[PDB]
Symmetry: D2
Subunit: 157 residues, 4 copies
Amino acid sequence: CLTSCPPLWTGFNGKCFRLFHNHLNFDNAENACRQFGLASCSGDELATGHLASIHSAESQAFLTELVKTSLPDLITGGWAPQVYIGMKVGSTNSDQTWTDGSSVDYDGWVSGEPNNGPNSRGAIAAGDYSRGFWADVYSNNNFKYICQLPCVHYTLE
Amino acid sequence: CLTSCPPLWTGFNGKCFRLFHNHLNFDNAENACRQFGLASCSGDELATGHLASIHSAESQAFLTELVKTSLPDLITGGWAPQVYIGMKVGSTNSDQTWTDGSSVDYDGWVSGEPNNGPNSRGAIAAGDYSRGFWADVYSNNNFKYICQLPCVHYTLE
Amino acid sequence: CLTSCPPLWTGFNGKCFRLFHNHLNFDNAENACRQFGLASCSGDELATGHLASIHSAESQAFLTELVKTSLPDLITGGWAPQVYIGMKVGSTNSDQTWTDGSSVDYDGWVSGEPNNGPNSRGAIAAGDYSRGFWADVYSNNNFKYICQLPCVHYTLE
Amino acid sequence: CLTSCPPLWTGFNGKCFRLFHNHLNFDNAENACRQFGLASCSGDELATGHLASIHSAESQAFLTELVKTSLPDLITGGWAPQVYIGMKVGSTNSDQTWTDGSSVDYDGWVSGEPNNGPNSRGAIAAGDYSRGFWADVYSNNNFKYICQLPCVHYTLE
Ligand SMILES: OC[C@H]1O[C@H](OC[C@H]2O[C@H](O[C@]3(CO)O[C@H](CO)[C@@H](O)[C@@H]3O)[C@H](O)[C@@H](O)[C@@H]2O)[C@H](O)[C@@H](O)[C@H]1O
Ligand SMILES: OC[C@H]1O[C@H](OC[C@H]2O[C@H](O[C@]3(CO)O[C@H](CO)[C@@H](O)[C@@H]3O)[C@H](O)[C@@H](O)[C@@H]2O)[C@H](O)[C@@H](O)[C@H]1O
Ligand SMILES: OC[C@H]1O[C@H](OC[C@H]2O[C@H](O[C@]3(CO)O[C@H](CO)[C@@H](O)[C@@H]3O)[C@H](O)[C@@H](O)[C@@H]2O)[C@H](O)[C@@H](O)[C@H]1O
Ligand SMILES: OC[C@H]1O[C@H](OC[C@H]2O[C@H](O[C@]3(CO)O[C@H](CO)[C@@H](O)[C@@H]3O)[C@H](O)[C@@H](O)[C@@H]2O)[C@H](O)[C@@H](O)[C@H]1O
Ligand SMILES: [Ca+2]
Ligand SMILES: [Ca+2]
Ligand SMILES: [Ca+2]
Ligand SMILES: [Ca+2]
């Protein structure tokens, strides 16, 4: 297998991703990703896209390479460019969730992050300070963002 | 491109199919297909498999070929072998529905079928008389059957 | 990602397979598989299909299931049904090769096989004695056979 | 069907493409694309990648959208950004060939191009003057470029 994706999207480990270049706040970035859907052929919407979730060191490496190869002239000595992913930090730092409802089973935070709770949002920080690992930021920041299409698999049980 | 399907399944036009050799009546054959599903990577079940629906002359020819190449020693000069698909003929012959909820936009019936309603069921009749086109049959008949995995596609607004 | 295969073929671990029902001798079965191929889009033939090779316990298990689920009424308490794969046993039992030129890195022989050398041929023996593991047979025997399409991968170096 | 491509590549019409951001002359860009190839699982080399060829108005539209959505801050009111594709204009303007040896069955030239031959090279000119349609240029100019993996398909005759 290679992952199969639609035009302009790119696949890694069974999921399809796309970096978007318009700058949106967190809630508007998530809603932008929700415009992509998965429908049954008889016409029922089953699922939406979401800001990307990340579940392994390899996935983190892939998304970092996606950002850095896509934005090479924007890479700074700082955190920038920061690109939203689907991470929400709630009332305490243990309250981490992904917008797609998947488990937080991978920790990609830059040392000292998250540090802007309660209710902050995660971003891949692809600048040289952070090398793609995540920063938390306030949700009103307007950033580029990565969407994932609905992640689904057949159950052959 | 080509259609991606799990091992033992086979693809045509974005859908995955498998011919099962146990003989079941219509409702039980549909129940057997429903054992296959589609789930989000989150773990939420999203959709269920079904007896195959058929929407074009190309799809009809593909399934006819699947049946005849899988059951070459059973091909008779009549209707047999008959293999269930997801077609339900109700109270009158115009009351045709697929178990997957898809439209009845393709007519694959042998001339003179359906003729065994009410509440008869569709089968690919792969014998030389019918050449794969459909017979309706009594629903208590136990036949081999074709399942499809949940048919889904991305909606890219 | 699943494996992508043409209609009527089925995929496992990046390779596409198909069980054929016509009974052929070994050389004719291999020739039948060589009728399928891989070409460039501008029309240069690059590779040919072959009788299946098998490189792991999981691939062995898959092909056994392919046979047993396709030929359920033919399963005996002995060796039958026997289905050709691309294995050639030469002048001694250690001279094992696959028709596709791939390495013999997996040993799927039934205990006591090969024992019909020299120049015998391997077959999945799906009857209950052998449980899909391989028997060697004489090449003049006419059996069902499994083909693989050309196995290819991108080289991203 | 969707197109299956390696990570960081993206598919259209059964072909896999990637925009590279380093600026190379035509020969060096073509050589960079030739680093990517196709091999048999056995390890035999089968094919070599190339700068992209273009065979329809839809393919032209897709590649233009890939460039424009990838380089939005670079789009000028002129021809820039120009991005190499595999088009060679030879001794006369009618002598057009693709580096991958495919047919020149589609004409994407901006009105008045080609005009800098002999032995000029084609580029998608994604600036607003030209809207993605092609300019010919001196082959020593250093531009971004689009690669395409070897285009192959199964032959099931
Ligand atoms: O969202 C990215 C980032 O925003 C805030 O930090 C900005 C700040 O970071 C760096 O300053 C230092 C250098 O060691 O890093 C930490 C930041 O936490 C500071 O204590 C320290 O001075 C850069 O050098 C500065 O240019 C930049 O202004 C926020 O504090 C971070 O948590 C993170 O969210
Ligand atoms: O489910 C199979 C088939 O069963 C019944 O027809 C069986 C009948 O079919 C053929 O007879 C003719 C053609 O000579 O076909 C129509 C079928 O209705 C008959 O009126 C006509 O005599 C075979 O030639 C016969 O041997 C066989 O007994 C049922 O009536 C069909 O609708 C269909 O469901
Ligand atoms: O290709 C299948 C198989 O063919 C030969 O064995 C077939 C043979 O097996 C059984 O005979 C016995 C029963 O005890 O099993 C061994 C198998 O080696 C024989 O020595 C013994 O007589 C069946 O009872 C027979 O009807 C059948 O003819 C071949 O010998 C095997 O290596 C294997 O290739
Ligand atoms: O490779 C890009 C482009 O380079 C040269 O044209 C650049 C030139 O284009 C436009 O000039 C006009 C406007 O009508 O277009 C033709 C292009 O040949 C010129 O004769 C004419 O002045 C822009 O307005 C200019 O700013 C820009 O300098 C080359 O001539 C083109 O063939 C094409 O290769
Ligand atoms: Ca922070
Ligand atoms: Ca009938
Ligand atoms: Ca033997
Ligand atoms: Ca020019």
